[PDB]
Design a protein around this ligand. Sequence first.
Ligand SMILES: Nc1ncnc2c1ncn2[C@@H]1O[C@H](COP(=O)(O)OP(=O)(O)O)[C@@H](O)[C@H]1O
Ligand SMILES: [Mg+2]
Length: 652
Amino acid sequence: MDETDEDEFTPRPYQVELLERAMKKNTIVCLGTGSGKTFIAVMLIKELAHEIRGPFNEGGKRTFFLVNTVPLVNQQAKVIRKHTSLKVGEYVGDMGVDSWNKEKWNQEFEKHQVLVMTAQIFLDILNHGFISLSQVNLLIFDECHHAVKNHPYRQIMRHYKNLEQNDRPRILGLTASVINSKCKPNQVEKKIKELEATLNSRVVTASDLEEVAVQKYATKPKEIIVSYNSDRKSDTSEVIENIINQALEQLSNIEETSNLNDTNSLKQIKKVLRDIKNILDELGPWCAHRVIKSRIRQLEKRESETAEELRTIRELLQSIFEQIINVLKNLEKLQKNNSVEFVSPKVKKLLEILKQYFSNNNNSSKELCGIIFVERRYTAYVLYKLLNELSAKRDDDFSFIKCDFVVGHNSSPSSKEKSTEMNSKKQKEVLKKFRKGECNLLVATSVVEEGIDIPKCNLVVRFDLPKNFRSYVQSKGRARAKNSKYIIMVEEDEKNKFQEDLNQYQEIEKILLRLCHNRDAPSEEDFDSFEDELLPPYMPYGTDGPRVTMSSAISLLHRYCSKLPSDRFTTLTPKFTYIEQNNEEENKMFRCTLRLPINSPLREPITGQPMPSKKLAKRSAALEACKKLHEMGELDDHLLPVKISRKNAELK
RNA sequence: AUACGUCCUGAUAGUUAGUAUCCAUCG
RNA sequence: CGAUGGAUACUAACUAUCAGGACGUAU
Ligand SMILES: Nc1ncnc2c1ncn2[C@@H]1O[C@H](COP(=O)(O)OP(=O)(O)O)[C@@H](O)[C@H]1O
Ligand SMILES: [Mg+2]
C-alpha cells in the first residue's frame, strides 16, 4: 500500500525572488513560521555547488550548516540528503569528537561535501586551529535571533571580523521573531540595528508576501483561554498539606536548633520536601505518594553509605511520609474505583479539555495529534506516568490515549541510575514513532519547542504560561495542520496581567510586521564599533595559529584539571581568592588570585591584573595561568591537554 | 509663577550582588 | 550523578534622566 512520494519541487515565486536577492549580497530572511525557508536554503546551497568539487589539499572549500539542538540537526541533514545529490554528514556531542586528532579531522573534511553540526563544536574547531575561515564557502545561521551578548554566534562573528575582505564567505540567516526578550515598542529599531551590525547584513522581506501569496501557506491557529482556581480544595487535601506544613516547620526548627555535619544535606532534604509539597499542590496526593515511594527507593540506594544523624532525619521523614500514606489509605480512590475526584483542579480541567476534544473529533474522520508543554522535567515524567495509568485503567473515555515524553539528555562513564534517562538514539526513536502515528500525545519540555517540523497537529496545550515574545510566537506556530487550536491555562488572579501582556505582544507583532519593509543597508562603521574584548588574546604561533580567547580560559583550565590522573572520588578543582583594593580615583578595583591542586607540577600561585569587575579579574587570572602553563610545557602544539599517562610523565 | 540645591516617591536606562529554571560540553 | 559555560525570570543596592510631593535660596 506504500507509495513513494518525491517532492518534485516547483519553487513558488516569492522563493525565487528571495533566492535572487540573497545571491546578490548578504541578507537575512524574515518570514512567518511554516512558510518554507529551509527549501530556500537548499536552493541556495545547490546553486553554488560548483566550488566544492575540488580536493581539500589543493585549497578546496566546504559548506557548513549551524544548528542549536540535536533533533534539528538530524532532521535538516535528512532533508538536505533527500533533496540534493551531495554527501552529508552529521556531528554531535554524543560521539566524543574532542578526542580526535588532526588526521581524522582532515579525513572527515575530505570525505564529505556538506557538514552539519552544533555551534559549540564549530567554535571549538575554529579556536584550536584545525580549520581556517578562508576555506569555508558559505555559512548558514539557523535561528539567527540568538546572536546577542556572549552567545557562541557572536564569538564566531568576532572570528570572522578579523579576516580580510578578499576571501570572506557569504552569510545567510533564517528567523521568524527578530527580538529575543521582551521590550517596549520604542526599542525595536535599536534591537534590529544592533542585530544587523553584528551579523554584517541587511534584513529583507518580500513584496509579494504582503499580498495573499504567503498568507495562504502560513499557519495561524485559534486562541482559547481556560481559567481554573486552586483555592477550592478538598478538606482531606487541606489536612494533608497542613501536616506537611507543620512537618516543614518542625524540620526548620530542628535545623536552627541542632548542629549539622553538613547543613547542605538538610537543606537538600528541605528543598526536596518542598518539591513534594509543590507536586501535591499542582497534581494531587496519588502522584505525591508515587514520588514518595520513588524517594523510598532513593534512600534504599542511599542507606549503604550515610551518616547517623542524616539517616535519622531520613527515617523521620519516612515516618512522616508513612503517616501521609495512611491518610491516603482512607482516600484510596483506586480502591474505591473513583480516581477522578482526588486529582488537583488543574488536572481535572485538563482532563475535561481532553474529553471535550475527543467528543468534538469523534465525528471527524481525522485522528488526533496533540502536544503538551511543561516547564520542568519531573512534572513531565509524572504527568506521563499518570496518563499511562489512566489509559490502562480502561474507563469509558480514556481507552484511546497513548503517551510518551522527550527531554534533554546527559551522559557519563558512571551508571547514572535514575528514573529519567535519555539518549540520542532513543530520542530519535520516540520522534519517529510520533511521526508514524503510533502515539497520539507527547509531553515535552522546551527542547522540541523551537524549529521542529512536527507532524500535522490539531491541538497545542500550554500547561505553563509563556515567558516572553519569542516563546509565545514559536509555541503558537508549532501546530501545522488546518483548523488548529491553541489553548492556555491561566490561574484566576493572574488573568488581568496575562491579558495586558497579550495586548502588548500583539502590538509588538503589528509594529514588527511593518518596520521591516524597505530598510537601508548597514554601515561597516557599526561593525567596527562592537568590541567587548578588554584584553587581547594569546597567539603563540601567529595570527592563523591556535588562540586562547579570554572567554574560553576557565573551561580549558577545568578540562585540564579534570584530565589530571587522581582518585576517582576526589574531583580536583582550582581554588579562587579575591582581594579588593581601592585606587586613587576611589573607583572599584578587583584583583584575583589562583591556586592549583598539588597533583599538577605548577606549585606557585598565579596573580592576574586588576579589573573593574570580579568576573573580569577571574578571567584575566585564568588567561595568565594558561599562558604560563603552555610556556612550562604541558599543553601541546595544538594548545589542548596532552594525553599524558604515568609512563609519559616519567619519560618527560 | 520660574530656576538652583536638599529630602521622599514612581517610571525609564545602565552597572553590581543574590535566588530559581532551561539548554549545550566533559568525567 | 558531579563539574563547566551560555540564556530567561524575580529581588536588593548604586548611578544618571524624567515625572510628582516637601523644604531653603534667588529671580
Ligand atoms: N515548494 C514546496 N512544496 C511543497 N511543500 C513545501 C515547499 N516548501 C516548503 N514546503 C513545506 O513547508 C514546510 C515548512 O517547514 P520548514 O521549511 O521545515 O520550516 P519553516 O517553518 O521555517 O519553513 C515543510 O514541512 C515543507 O514540507
Ligand atoms: Mg527552520
